[PDB]
């Protein structure tokens, strides 16, 4: 069933990312035993939820979920209401509060808006966390756009040293859509994933959040460049290779040449 998970992930890497939600659900119907593994390994468009007690939005992901409820990073409460929901330790919660505050500033500085959410959890010899960022563009423009950042970092703390091992796996989901007369419906979306690992010094001037922050920042700056290249560069070029508005100076050479090379195998095979 590990080949199954592998097959499940390959499939989601091929079906239209525009329908990740419906398809993931169906995928789970098909293989109910992989439900937990898929909810954690398959990135899906980020959903916003409202923390009523604090009057602030927060983002949803498998990492702040317990059963059918999600934990707000602001009030540290579950919604819908739960009785004994999974909570980080009091000490990790404090670091979680600080990580949310630091990334709120990070978000405002690079996205000038949108929503961010950070959730942490303890590990055997370290801890992990997920940094979520969602930014939607001008709802008044012909073309809609949305950026979803999903950063999962694993921190391996060293017994002696205060140098830690950081493993960051990041995915940026970029969605672009337009409903204009001349183009009908045009949807350019999906995501790119990158991974990075580094050993780093941990000190009072460069604590865990600073190290994670620097890694996230470098990661997003790199993925932003790749996104621009792939979305507006590569897919456009593939599009121009499918059709051309100007008459393509017909080429006999390639067809004449192919005839020559083909008969070689035909008059060679049987």
């Amino acid at each position: 069933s590990d080949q199954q998970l592998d097959c499940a992930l390959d499939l989601m890497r091929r079906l239209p990312p525009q329908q990740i939600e419906k398809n993931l659900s169906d995928l789970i119907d098909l293989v109910p035993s992989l439900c937990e593994d898929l909810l954690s390994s398959v990135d899906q468009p980020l959903k916003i939820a409202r923390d009523k007690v604090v009057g602030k939005d927060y983002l949803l992901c498998d990492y702040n979920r317990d059963g059918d409820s999600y934990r707000s990073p602001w009030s540290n409460k579950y919604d819908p209401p739960l009785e004994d929901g999974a909570m980080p330790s009091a000490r990790l919660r404090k670091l979680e509060v600080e990580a949310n505050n630091a990334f709120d500033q990070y978000r405002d500085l690079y996205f000038e808006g949108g929503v961010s959410s950070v959730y942490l959890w303890d590990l055997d010899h370290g801890f992990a966390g997920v940094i979520l960022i969602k930014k939607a563009g001008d709802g008044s423009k012909k073309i809609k756009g949305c950026w979803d950042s999903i950063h999962v970092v694993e921190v391996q703390e060293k017994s002696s040293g205060r140098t830690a091992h950081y493993k960051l796996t990041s995915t940026v989901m970029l969605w672009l859509q337009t409903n204009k007369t001349g183009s009908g419906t045009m949807n350019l979306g999906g995501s790119l994933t990158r991974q990075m690992e580094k050993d780093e010094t941990v000190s009072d001037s460069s604590p865990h959040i600073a190290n994670i922050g620097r890694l996230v920042e470098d990661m997003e700056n790199k993925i932003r460049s790749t996104l621009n290249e792939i979305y507006f560069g590569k897919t456009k070029d593939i599009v121009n290779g499918l059709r051309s508005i100007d008459a393509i100076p017909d080429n006999q050479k390639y067809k004449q040449l192919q005839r020559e090379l083909s008969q070689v195998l035909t008059q060679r095979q049987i």
Partner: protein, 275 residues
Amino acid sequence: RVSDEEKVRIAAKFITHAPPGEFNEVFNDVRLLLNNDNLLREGAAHAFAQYNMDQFTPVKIEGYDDQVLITEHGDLGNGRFLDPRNKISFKFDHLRKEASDPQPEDTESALKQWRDACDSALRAYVKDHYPNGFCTVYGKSIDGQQTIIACIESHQFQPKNFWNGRWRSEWKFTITPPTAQVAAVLKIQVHYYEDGNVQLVSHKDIQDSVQVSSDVQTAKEFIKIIENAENEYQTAISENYQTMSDTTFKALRRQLPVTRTKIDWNKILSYKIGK
């Protein structure tokens, strides 16, 4: 409990929705996920057929130099398809790449007059605008009314570089002299999947009212309708790409912070107005 019938329908949906040039990968995935070959064979044939059909799968009959388009319009119904151009009958084997053992198909020859004109008139349009394109025009009688159905397909598959793309256009010409009505749908799909999954899915639906004259004349009138509509569609697409890249994308995340220098994390972790 999800019945086996529901699982089969799910499996079928996934398979028929594979992106261009990636049918097998998707099929193998679903097969290992479903983990029940008996159920898989229940809708396989139907899945394969539907896929190739809505994908306008260009196929090469045993030896006609025939790149013909597998569509519904050419679905005989017995497990064989029509090649309106060469005008034969060919049985399409869905698993294997080839479709052989043809059968001559002496026609109805009623709408064929128009059909044969549009066909090679469009065949010229295609060779001029689609690098690796192919076309198939169907002459048929749809519940009394005569209609010309031109189908265009073009693709580029480069799995080793993790991407595939395909163009699909379908034009339905329903004749009602003097002037007739047009109905079409243009489709584009591109998939890039090196360390990600990015896809362009687009389509345009168009309806036009055209004046019907002669045989070789109305044909060139059509190829003209199409040419202008598809150039307009493609044009609107390159423009959309331009705006997305110079307006929408930049409105999402900046390249550098407002502070105009990378972030000073030590400053973010402490620096306060006062408390």
